[PDB]
Amino acid sequence: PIKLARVTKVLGRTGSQGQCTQVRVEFMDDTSRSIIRNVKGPVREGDVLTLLESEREARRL
Amino acid sequence: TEQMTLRGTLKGHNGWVTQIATTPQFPDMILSASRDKTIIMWKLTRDETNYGIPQRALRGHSHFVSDVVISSDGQFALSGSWDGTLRLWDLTTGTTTRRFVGHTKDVLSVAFSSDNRQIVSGSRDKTIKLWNTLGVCKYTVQDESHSEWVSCVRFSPNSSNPIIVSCGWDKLVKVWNLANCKLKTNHIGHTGYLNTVTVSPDGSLCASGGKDGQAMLWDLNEGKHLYTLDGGDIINALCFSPNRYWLCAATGPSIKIWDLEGKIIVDELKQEVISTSSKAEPPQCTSLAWSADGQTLFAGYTDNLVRVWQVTIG
Amino acid sequence: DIKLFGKWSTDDVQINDISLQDYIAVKEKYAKYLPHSAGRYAAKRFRKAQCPIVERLTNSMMMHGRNNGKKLMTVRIVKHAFEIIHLLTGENPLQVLVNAIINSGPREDSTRIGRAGTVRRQAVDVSPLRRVNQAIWLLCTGAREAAFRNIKTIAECLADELINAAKGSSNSYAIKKKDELERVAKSNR
Amino acid sequence: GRVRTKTVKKAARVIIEKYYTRLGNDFHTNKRVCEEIAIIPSKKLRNKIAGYVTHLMKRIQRGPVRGISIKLQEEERERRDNYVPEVSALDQEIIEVDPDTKEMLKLLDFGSLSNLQVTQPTVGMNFKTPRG
Amino acid sequence: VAQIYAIRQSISKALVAYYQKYVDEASKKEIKDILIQYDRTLLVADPRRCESKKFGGPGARARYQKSYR
Amino acid sequence: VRHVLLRQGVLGIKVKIMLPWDPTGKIGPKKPLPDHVSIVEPKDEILPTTPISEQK
RNA sequence: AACGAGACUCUGGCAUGCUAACUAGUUACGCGACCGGUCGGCGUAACUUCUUAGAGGGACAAGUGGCGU
């Protein structure tokens, strides 16, 4: 299912041309799951991300 | 017994409250020069949520206004600033009427006479300028005034023979004979520069403080170092008190009000309960103001505001 | 107190998504009388989040080369669209704008990695500010592309897609691009 | 970025070192004294010397700094270095020697010393670090 | 457009100076906070002006198209 | 910059002179270089030991 | 230690503060004209906000808070 999220701390900006920010992502269900994700676009700390598959992992492309 | 308490702050400035002047003829208007180029007429409602409101800002200066003074009546003012000018004001409609040019450095302080006709001023030009009430200077001083700046100039409001006195940054309190422009007394006693001079209302005891932090006061009739008042950091300002017979001295972050003949520090005057922004410096206390009744004490601070002090007789 | 074009108020506008709440403007103090403000929103990063999104839609309306400076042209296009929207729906015409910006932006893009001619992409997330940036782009180019050689004016062609994006229809150009931008995104995943 | 070149820092260091009594924390009265002490070609350099001086005077309250040397600290360090305690740290009535130290003193005919209190020697010969 | 944004700035800056010169400072504050809260360009001038054209291109930043070989 | 005509052709001669300071009593420019900060050597403040009231 | 970098020079932005304006004006006063309004229509005076251009100010990472051996 779809899962709504939050941003704890932005880690670093990865990608082929530096287009992807890599971000440490908390959930909004009071969950202690601090997943790391690949977000494309401008991000600061304290965003509200919206994922479709909430079990994916951060790689470096 | 007699303590000093807070009732409120007069928050109307944007720069440092450089010097405060109060008048005994009006118990409602306070005049506080500032470092945001404006002098603000205050109005004292003395209620619970505003001890003072601003009434008429006086804007003529293109730099930091240093020293303001009110006349013997509550309708004329006088001020100077760091652009070498002096602006004679008008309290009724809130404008200027006369403008005193002739200085070549920053006008540091300006004193007002009791007869309201002798205007004196000290600048960074190592010179003292004596004026009319109109604008033509009468005599400019190069009688070896100081080797460096002239930080504060003050008249002597005595019923006796008057005198004019002016400290400086060369550790010296030089005494001058008015209308004859000659030295009277030197006082080689200070380590480091000076910041202010105040004169007691009788006209006998002058005080003078500076970088040494110690209010070394002198006598105007014979020249004795009477009392070595002690302080912590720099003395930004000094002022006397006619009724309670004290000496208001300025610490950096606090105020030291002193019994004079007893030499007891009676109160400490400060307000710091914060801790996350106390890693830096606490704000200095730049000026001091004593009103007519002496129940109120006004201080000029570095958080752009003026704090009131009440003498609770206990 | 503050009505857009003096007629449309903002108190009953309700943003649905929590993902776009801090980024999509006016509900409270970004209420302006007109979309023209002439303010320095591009002076820093993230500063254009604090600009009224009516001015965002106005600014992206003038994209093509023959209209590139014309702001007084596009503000009356938006003003005339906010009549046709209200006629064809019957409600406040700002709730449909945030319903269109919520619905139109994708939530999973693909980032391009390969060699000269070789394409092997990979699916990533979408920041909600890029969702707001790409919502208004798809809306405005749908209004632009379907009014070109057509008797329909730009005010009708903007309004008839600004409601069709709120209803989530697949006749609107905006939702037709979002579902394909996620369809080719899921195809790698 | 905003880095001050060797001109600003060299001039600021000499003008601290010679005129520390006049300089305080206000940048404005620092600028009014840095244009009366020094002859700077004008303002945009004058305000950069006076700003590093205003950042450098706050750095002197918190201790010394590794460049300049000013004689309010260098008298306090001088009075800190001429500090003797009342009774020295070498006047101990019970000083501890090994067994073998007492044998060296007996070679030096100092076995008649009374203050020495020989300790029990260590039972294990374990002093090398565990290599590997 | 540049004269509209100059008229509305001078209306605001005129009413504020009238309330400072012939009314009290408190009413000037209660005007100024609403004027600032709406848009700061009703009291503070916008200081951006046009850059200068440079040789090598059609304007300030843009350059002429170049070719190869 | 000047020219010479020799036997074989032309030479050029370029001569640059960096002039010195000393405000113009006949020589050099007046103002110093824009990075040359001079500092007035302080006569030391004499040490104030005891309060002497010199009435003159 | 020397050069290049930076400083420097011109320009933009601010000043109801200074200097002055019939080859720039605004405000006020009469007159005139048409309905207290409108005058880029006419002449006097208060003065420099607008216009000009000179000196001098103003911003320094200076203030607060985080991170930096």
Short mmCIF file of C-alpha atoms (C1' of nucleotides) in Angstrom, two decimals, chain G residues 10-58:
data_model
loop_
_atom_site.label_atom_id
_atom_site.label_comp_id
_atom_site.label_asym_id
_atom_site.label_seq_id
_atom_site.Cartn_x
_atom_site.Cartn_y
_atom_site.Cartn_z
"C1'" C G 10 34.38 53.52 -12.55
"C1'" U G 11 29.13 52.08 -11.95
"C1'" G G 12 24.21 50.50 -9.37
"C1'" G G 13 21.47 50.92 -4.84
"C1'" C G 14 20.36 54.45 0.30
"C1'" A G 15 20.25 59.91 2.87
"C1'" U G 16 12.98 64.66 4.24
"C1'" G G 17 21.08 65.17 6.96
"C1'" C G 18 25.22 69.31 4.62
"C1'" U G 19 26.41 72.52 0.21
"C1'" A G 20 23.08 75.51 -3.87
"C1'" A G 21 20.07 76.23 -8.11
"C1'" C G 22 15.75 81.67 -14.09
"C1'" U G 23 19.67 76.88 -18.33
"C1'" A G 24 15.43 71.95 -12.64
"C1'" G G 25 11.74 72.75 -9.76
"C1'" U G 26 7.69 71.65 -5.68
"C1'" U G 27 4.48 74.26 -2.25
"C1'" A G 28 1.81 78.82 -1.34
"C1'" C G 29 -0.33 83.59 -2.97
"C1'" G G 30 -3.05 86.65 -6.38
"C1'" C G 31 -4.83 86.88 -11.57
"C1'" G G 32 -7.26 84.44 -15.69
"C1'" A G 33 -10.29 80.47 -17.82
"C1'" C G 34 -14.24 76.38 -17.42
"C1'" C G 35 -17.63 73.89 -14.21
"C1'" G G 36 -14.70 73.95 -3.58
"C1'" G G 37 -12.45 70.96 -7.97
"C1'" U G 38 -9.02 71.45 -13.34
"C1'" C G 39 -5.12 73.91 -15.71
"C1'" G G 40 2.15 71.48 -18.82
"C1'" G G 41 -2.13 78.89 -17.93
"C1'" C G 42 0.60 83.82 -16.19
"C1'" G G 43 3.65 86.38 -12.61
"C1'" U G 44 5.69 86.41 -7.74
"C1'" A G 45 7.64 84.83 -2.33
"C1'" A G 46 9.06 79.82 1.59
"C1'" C G 47 12.32 76.10 0.36
"C1'" U G 48 15.24 72.11 -2.10
"C1'" U G 49 11.17 66.42 -0.97
"C1'" C G 50 11.19 65.40 -6.24
"C1'" U G 51 15.85 67.08 -10.57
"C1'" U G 52 20.98 68.05 -10.79
"C1'" A G 53 26.38 67.09 -8.54
"C1'" G G 54 29.96 67.85 -4.79
"C1'" A G 55 31.95 66.70 0.09
"C1'" G G 56 31.00 63.38 3.97
"C1'" G G 57 28.34 59.05 5.85
"C1'" G G 58 26.68 53.77 5.42
#
